[PDB]
Amino acid sequence: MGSMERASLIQKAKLAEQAERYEDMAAFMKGAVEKGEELSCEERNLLSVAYKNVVGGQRAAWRVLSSIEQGPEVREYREKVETELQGVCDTVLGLLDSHLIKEAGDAESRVFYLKMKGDYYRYLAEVATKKRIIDSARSAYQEAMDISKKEMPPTNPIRLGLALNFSVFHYEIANSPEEAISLAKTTFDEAMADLHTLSEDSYKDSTLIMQLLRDNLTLWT
């Protein structure tokens, strides 16, 4: 994507999003990040959306295959899918590490990237067969949690989405359903108590995410 203008990559990432062409969207966003400039809020979201969708289809495929797995073909093909997923996670992690996280000074960008780092290590963990990967997820989430708690209101969408994913990590990956539940509940309760400060639009944004915490808690309790 070396020869395409940054702005052109961003414009094409948005078109690919409209076209539900998420692999293209991700390639364009990777090109953009690799221009070496920081991403705006909107660009970070594009990056996240693109790879979430790519890796989301790989995760869904991997789980179908894994379950079938329970001659060598099923294992081979699950390995193939698994390998591709891991390569996607490695390239997201690569982008974070070169050099999105280190140049992210604001709480907004830094928590976003650290959350993302935890997410992609969590995806790696889902297929790992592993403690180091889980610890890399935990550590990235934890650093993101510490900044978000210090630097963002409890209703901030990224703070909420970070806490939601960290709670999922706890439940699904760290075998700590109590930690998962305590986190989701504490997150929801503190957001609830901060809603009064919001405009109607921010209120809608936060409560939409709080409902996922609530749905998880209903699933878990």
Partner: peptide, 6 residues
């Protein structure tokens, strides 16, 4: 369990 629907 739902994760952030980014």
């Amino acid at each position: 369990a739902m994760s952030f629907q980014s």
